[PDB]
Amino acid sequence: GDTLDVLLPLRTTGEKAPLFCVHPAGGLSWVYSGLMQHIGADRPLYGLQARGLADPSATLPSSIEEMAADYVTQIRGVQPSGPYHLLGWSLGSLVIHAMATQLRAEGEEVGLLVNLDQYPIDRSRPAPESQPDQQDALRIMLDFVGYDMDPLDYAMVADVLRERQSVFANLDETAITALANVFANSRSLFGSFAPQPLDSDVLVIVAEPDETVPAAELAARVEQWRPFVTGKIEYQTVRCSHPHMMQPEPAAEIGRLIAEKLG
Amino acid sequence: GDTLDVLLPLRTTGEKAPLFCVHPAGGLSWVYSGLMQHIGADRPLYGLQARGLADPSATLPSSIEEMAADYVTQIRGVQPSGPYHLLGWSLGSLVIHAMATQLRAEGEEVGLLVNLDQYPIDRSRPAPESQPDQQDALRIMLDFVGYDMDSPLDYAMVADVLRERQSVFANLDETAITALANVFANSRSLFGSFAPQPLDSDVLVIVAEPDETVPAAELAARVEQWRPFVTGKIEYQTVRCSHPHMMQPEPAAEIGRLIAEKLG
């Protein structure tokens, strides 16, 4: 049906400007359903998922700029003007940056931008730790259905998803392979994205499970975005690993922080 | 067992210098078994496969240079000196280029370099067509077992065909399928970051052009895209198949015979 469509309507009712959330490298935005309980219950929530999932024969975007233009089209279809509130995680963070710059060049107003623990890429020497990991994409998918974490493979995750959530019943080997395809493409887009300066404030959520890390280190990690952000760079830390940021407690903290900044 | 190891001994016997073949983006070098019949029966043939297949817990290389250094270690274990004959396909071509430059920086002699239809990447805007495609990696694997292509591929279907046709892929499980996807995603992230260095060697480029109406000058210019990175002779030869089908029987026969011709 509509489980894998590019624009994913997680909640359409609400009079305020929607929050648009862009997928991690895995391509699925069902994970941001963990936010609905905690953002204002009058805020619509839309997901943006990767081309190539609903239609495995679709031409995948070859740059983050092209992916961002596609998604800007989609979100302008839902919200004609007003402040655009974007949220990203991993690849989505890069995508929303591009979206935000494009929206600005169009004279549109950009509201809240929430970056879940993604930092700029050294294009001459891409650090593995700055890039998506396949096991992390599978962990994100397993968190989506509350799998108790205590080497993953696609078939096991698909079986948990089809068991667990009824709307993944018709998730077949075609869709599993399309997920792998989208992940590979998304990984090939990190090394070639050059973000442009953005005249807006950004909120960066830092995933730091180690509480022995000094606050200055979190702030310095966050200031890697300074060459591309001309506004305030605000940050907040959750005590979990990068893939676990939509588990119940970090999702609650992120959602409540978002609600208070949109209020 | 030993099906997925980094160094794959396809033929170890022979007095002549081996041919070392580096995997396409899919990570598997079994496909180059299509060459054994046609390269001299005195030539050893070794495959180089991706880290992360035999051990899904291995640290994957983060650059083509690091992958190439790993593989140079492996091939020096088989051949202590002499001319190093390298063959690559898709990602492997980039890898062998790096290997050759490293080998020449170490004062080692590089012999034949065979590039199967890979061209340099514009790192500021990587063209999709010059990059690996997942369906093409699956087609390469299906060609390996002679599947007939006049029939959207998926990993599970390919794994079942592989298990059914060649039983050294028996007990190829979901762990291994996942590891193949992982390897493919990583290899795809290695394009666009790799800056090839000038290589003072001759290279042979095999062009995959199924369209006979393409003029010969276009094939030659396509090949001369390698000129900034090759200071020697750039020779080329065309096979009448698409990129993923270059190890089917007729292109494999042409490539193997040409290689024997150049090594003889």
User: In whole angstroms, what is the distance from residue B179 CA to residue B60 CA?
Assistant: 11
Q: Identify any residues that bridge with B88 across adjacent strands, giving them in sequence order.
A: B22, B115
Q: Identify which of B26, B61, B255 has the alpha carbon closest to the alpha carbon of residue B158.
A: B26
3-class secondary structure, A7: strand
Does B127 touch chain A if contact means CB atoms closer than 8 Å? yes
Contact between B64 and B132 (Cβ < 8 Å): no
What residue ranges define each of the domains in chain B, with the CATH number in brackets? 7-263 (3.40.50.1820)
CB pairs under 8 A between A and B: 94
Length reported for chain A? 263
Interchain pair B174, A156: CB under 8 A: yes
Please give the resolution of this entry in Å, rounded to 1 decimal: 2.3
- C-beta separation of A185 from B25 below 8 A: no
Radius of gyration of chain B (CA): 17
Give Cβ neighbours of residue B196 (< 8 Å, ≥ 6 apart). Answer: B94, B97, B98, B101, B120, B229
Q: Residue A262's closest CA among A20, A13, A17?
A: A17
Structure-determination technique = X-ray
What is the residue type of A204?
Answer: V
Q: Name residue, tokens 């999709």.
A: B128
Write out the two tokens for B60: 């994957």
The first and second tokens of residue B154, run together, are 């998926």
| CB-CB under 8 Å, A154 with B178 | yes
Q: Which are the contacts of B97, defined by CB distance < 8 A and separation ≥ 6?
A: B88, B113, B115, B196, B199, B229
Q: Do A151 and B57 touch (CB under 8 A)?
A: yes
Q: Do the chains contact at B189 and A192, CB–CB below 8 Å? A: no
Q: Which of residues 140-159 of A touch B (CB under 8 A)?
A: 151-156
With the CA atoms of B186, B188, B192 and B196 taken in that order, what torsion angle do they form, in degrees rounded to the nearest 10? Answer: 80
Q: Tell me the three-class secondary structure of A129-151, residue by residue.
A: HHCCCHHHHHHHHHHHCCCCCCC
Q: How many CB atoms lie within 10 A of CB A120?
A: 17
Query: B84-89 and B45-48 as β-strands: parallel, antiparallel, unpaired?
Result: unpaired
Nearest to A191 among B60, B182, B192 (CB): B192
| Set of chain A residues whose Cβ sits within 8 Å of the Cβ of B189 | 126, 131, 187-188, 190-191
Q: Which chain A residues are closer than 8 Å to B90 by Cβ? A: none
Look up residue A180 and give its two tokens.
């792998």
Q: Is B41 helix (H, G, I), strand (E, B) or coil?
A: coil
Task: Find which of A134, A139, A176 to mutate to test the B interface (most B CBs within 10 Å of its CB).
Answer: A134
For residues A140, B125, A200, A85, the Cα torsion angle rounded to the nearest 10 degrees is: -40
Tokens of A34: 């963990």
* Strand residue runs (E) in chain A: 7-11, 19-22, 45-48, 84-89, 110-116, 202-207, 233-238
Least Cα distance to A38 among A238, A260, A206 occurs for A260
In DSSP notation, B100-135 reads: HHHHHHTT--EEEEEEES-----TTS--GGGS--HH
**Sheet of strand B19-22: strand arrangement:** B7-11, B45-48, B19-22, B84-89, B110-116, B203-208, B234-239
Closest-CA residue of A relative to B156 is A173
Q: Residue A97: count other Cβ atoms within 10 Å of its Cβ.
A: 27
Do B154 and A200 touch, CB atoms closer than 8 A?
no
- Pairing state of beta strands A7-11 and A45-48? antiparallel
Q: CA–CA separation, B174 vs B153, rounded Å?
A: 16
CA distance A227 to B133: 34
Question: CB-based contact (8 Å) between A216 and chain B?
Answer: no
- Distance from the A42 Cα atom to the nearest Cα atom in chain B, whole angstroms: 39
- DSSP run (H or E) holding A227: none
CA quadruple B105, B225, B90, A151: dihedral sign: positive
How many other CB atoms are found less than 10 A from the CB of residue A21? 27
Distance from chain centroid for Cα A143: 15
Alpha-carbon separation of residue B131 from A92, A242, B184 (angstroms): 22, 29, 11
Strands A202-207 and A84-89: unpaired
And the tokens for B89? 């396909």
Compare CB distances from B155 to A152, A177, A191 and report the shortest one's residue.
A177
What is the separation, in whole angstroms, between the first and last Cα of chain B?
35
Facing residue for B154 by CB, picked from A57, A151, A177? A177
Considering only the beta carbons, identify the residue of B63, B178, B185 that sits closest to A187.
Answer: B185
Residue A203, class by beta-carbon neighbours within 10 Å (0-12 exposed, 13-18 middle, 19+ buried)?
buried
SS (H, E, C) A43-65: CCEEEECCCCCCCCCCCCCCCHH
- Taking contacts as CB-CB distances below 8 angstroms, the residues of chain B near A173 are 154-157
Q: What SS3 state is found at B190?
A: helix
Query: Do A206 and A117 touch, CB atoms closer than 8 A?
Result: yes
Distance CA A16, CA A262 (A): 10
Q: Which two tokens stand for residue A181?
A: 């395809």
b (16+ CB within 10 A) / e for B166-185: beebeebebebbbbbbbbbb
Helix then strand count (H, E) for chain A reads: 7, 7
